[PDB]
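Ticket #4471: complex job returned nothing on first submit. Input attached below:
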Amino acid sequence: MASFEKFEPIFGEVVPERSDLLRRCLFHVYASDSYNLTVHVTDFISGVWTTILSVSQLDDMRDTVGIGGSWSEFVDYTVASLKSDNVKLLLGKTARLVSQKAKGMPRINVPLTKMVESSASEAMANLSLELFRAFKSKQH
Amino acid sequence: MASFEKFEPIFGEVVPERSDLLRRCLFHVYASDSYNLTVHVTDFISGVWTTILSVSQLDDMRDTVGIGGSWSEFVDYTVASLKSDNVKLLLGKTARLVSQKAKGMPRINVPLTKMVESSASEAMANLSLELFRAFKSKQH
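Support reply: We reran it on our side without changes. The output follows.
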């Protein structure tokens, strides 16, 4: 009961909010293996931001961000937070996709790094291809 | 009664097929202005195949395709044809997105050309960003 074996993919939009061209970005959350969660954020022009979040590091965040309780409660909150319109993107080489379900709610901070040229293109292709497959499935 | 003013965008999947790498492609059909139809086909890795179809060239195909009837009937056929699973991509800087609503129906051939690098990136960004907006509206 602590594995992403049955985790449906997550798609969403984020607006970059750096403080020195900031276009509109899409992100993709999905299970690479039954224990890791891979995140991709991209505007499809300025590369791809990626990281992999395993059950261990996912739990370490749960203790440091105050939200206590069973594993399902943290992951169910994260799904609701990451699929709500309150997902902001703070750009700085690195970036931190911050999300919260409601205002003054526990704040989820997923640190990010910029992709390599080889995988940046492959990342966007998967994001769109999976988003379409998820779109075409919600029609039938 | 011959304008693309009330034309919903179309998204779909197509598999290329050369005759001489090959990955999977998504396409996007939409009205740039009330008289032209812009199509984008891309695998998000190699490039973007694009053209723009005004009402004139669309009508010239109506005579060559053989399907006869009212404008609205032909365009409703093209809408149904481009949303079926019979969409092929024939590569030969050229391409021919051929579609038919079903097996044994008139076949619609939309010729294509390869984009330039500057707008190719923006083309994929628009397809995906619009695909998400269409996805979030259907899940409403």
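The interface with chain A takes residues 11-13, 23-24, 26, 43-45, 121-122, 124-125, 127-129, 131-132, 134-135, 138-139 of chain B (CB under 8 Å). Closing as resolved unless it happens again.
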